[PDB]
């Protein structure tokens, strides 16, 4: 009754709120504020999913005009340099979706870019909850990811350090947006910003003291093989290695703007300024989705599927027996298991893109509830050899090659 | 010869459609070589040769565009999948993005990168003005670059800073030096312009605080000012009107990024926050190019010689030239057009912003530049905030100039 009125309103608002595309000939000569107002007044994520789905599908590209312009370019190929360029630009203009003009005019508003980050955070969520589907919403994602990638480029971000002198609103923000290894109490947070620890974040030049992405570094004497050893440690007031034990994205709307890739790049330069005799850099990273992949394969060795759900770690006989098998299955999950030719694991793909080496597989590195249920206690060290991060980054993105240690490659030699 | 080899190894290559999201590792080092070689170019003619080659050589791959255009049309003859078409459309969309855009993008990420690109557009504009570079390829590259600069220097990315005698003297020097309207005489004059009954505001980029891009000088008075010497040469110890007596830009590379339009918008909001009972806003703007236009018409021989500073000395000549020069000024502002819009650049600026050609002031600037520039004449472009929106629309859209009865009477005389 009042539901069919909510649906009717969206279609009217998108018509009168989405700015119109002018003719290519006249492309040189309040609507957006109505959109922001209506979008704000949407309570549930399912409501917002309905509006985003209609915007993507209804206000994209005029597929008809694109074909007319595509043929118009091919008709000239059978005149003049300026004649060709004008027809190319006609097609370039025809390929610009009508919603892009809305996102562009919204940015020009007070707190406009902030709104758009929230709107892509919701769009990515609605896609994850399968509330929105289709290639139209996927295109609208890329258009937004593209615009945001220009506003939040490396050169518009400031590197800020978190100490116990930082505001508690910033420490709360950093504590809350910490899904890797959650913070237990305020005394734990004080330790993670305390001596032998370095906590860094990126803020936009526009919004200082607002974390966009967070990186936790531990100053140690060896490449760490255990997370408990880092998080549950009381260091006093010489360092050989810098271990990245946690990397977190605060704004989910900026998922894919390479914020973490530039964060590590920056922090290393900062740590090299502070310790000019520091040449060991590595991560101690979780292997999320491993247990899920392992249980997904297991579809009597039925005892295995059942047991692999936290409680199995209690038996010393079962853990000891599962060392060599789970480590060779992990080595394959990281090195051999692919997705679109690239590494199946999202964390491994992240570090391999950055030029890291799949250096070590650590048994019972995270004996926490999330550590055992997530990656069966296993963690890995993606080692950063600064002298070769460049070529490794290139070899992975370009030729889809994973550089791995002899330890890791031996475990894959055991498999297959 | 070096330019062709350098550009081939300094302009980052177009990544595969599949890897269009990832920053290549060499792309930083490639763009730093460009900045280094560009810096080492002495004359503008050298820089013009490099920019001309970049535009022409590193634009769009015209061959791949035709392959993608045909590929889309092959998918039209046969009603294919929705996602199949969209991917083919996006490949064509990607094929239409020029290779130099990736250089400008990767240069920005560099330390002092956006600063370099502002200088590079300042040079590109100059080389075009000196006809060192020509063609539609350099025109496209200036649009690509201006487009990027118009996003980085958007109101959201700018800070509104206020200048008081508490500001660093490096900022006051920068602001004194930036004066492109009514030059500052001494440090005591500058102290007055930031002093009581005066508001000085500027825009700095969020990346570079305390570095002015655009400056606006406001005078807090009891009436709409009719004389500039009454403002600049005054020792102040209730305010009715806010008079904008000077607006200055500091970067030629940001020519067309609409900074002055956003400063007036933001300064008014700031003035209203300070003074909620303030409803009178106007400018006291000069009329530059008027004397030049007037002398240009005179080609009646005595006035062509006399109109060059010294004529103001005779009280009989000034008194006689009061009613004629004001009616010729009224026409120069209201009737004289350029591409249908106001001939005067200052008048076009304020009318775009939604101002009204409110008053023509006789002997408002009796300075050497004031008499030689606009024959002592100045004008008040009044901002009626309740109607700035429709006035802005009427001027840009229908090319209509809203004027006062005083101004329209002088055009009725003409």
Author numbering:
A (entry chain A): -9 to -1, 40 to 59, 66 to 114, 117 to 275, 282 to 343, 372 to 488
B (entry chain B): -2 to -1, 40 to 274, 282 to 343, 373 to 487
Article, verbatim:
Wild-type HsMCD (residues 40–491, corresponding to the mature mitochondrial form) failed to crystallize. The structure of the E58A/K59A/E278A/E279A/K280A quintuple mutant was determined by single isomorphous replacement with anomalous scattering and refined at 2.8 Å resolution. The mutant exhibited similar oligomeric and enzymatic properties as wild-type HsMCD. Inspection of the structure revealed both alanine-substituted patches to be located in surface-exposed regions: Glu58-Lys59 was found in the loop connecting helices αA and αB, while the loop containing residues 278–280, connecting strands β3 and β4, was disordered. The HsMCD crystal structure shows that the tetramer is made of a dimer of dimers. A tight dimer of HsMCD is formed by extensive contacts of the helical domains of the two monomers, and the αD and αE helical inserts of the two monomers interact with each other in this dimer interface. Two HsMCD dimers then associate with each other through their catalytic domains, at ∼60° angle for the planes of the two dimers, to form the tetramer with 222 symmetry.
Malonyl-coenzyme A decarboxylase (MCD) is found from bacteria to humans, has important roles in regulating fatty acid metabolism and food intake, and is an attractive target for drug discovery. The MCD monomer contains an N-terminal helical domain involved in oligomerization and a C-terminal catalytic domain. Unexpectedly, the MCD catalytic domain is structurally homologous to those of the GCN5-related N-acetyltransferase superfamily, especially the curacin A polyketide synthase catalytic module, with a conserved His-Ser/Thr dyad important for catalysis. The catalytic domain of MCD contains a central eight-stranded, mostly antiparallel β sheet (β1–β8) that is surrounded by at least 11 α helices (α1–α11).
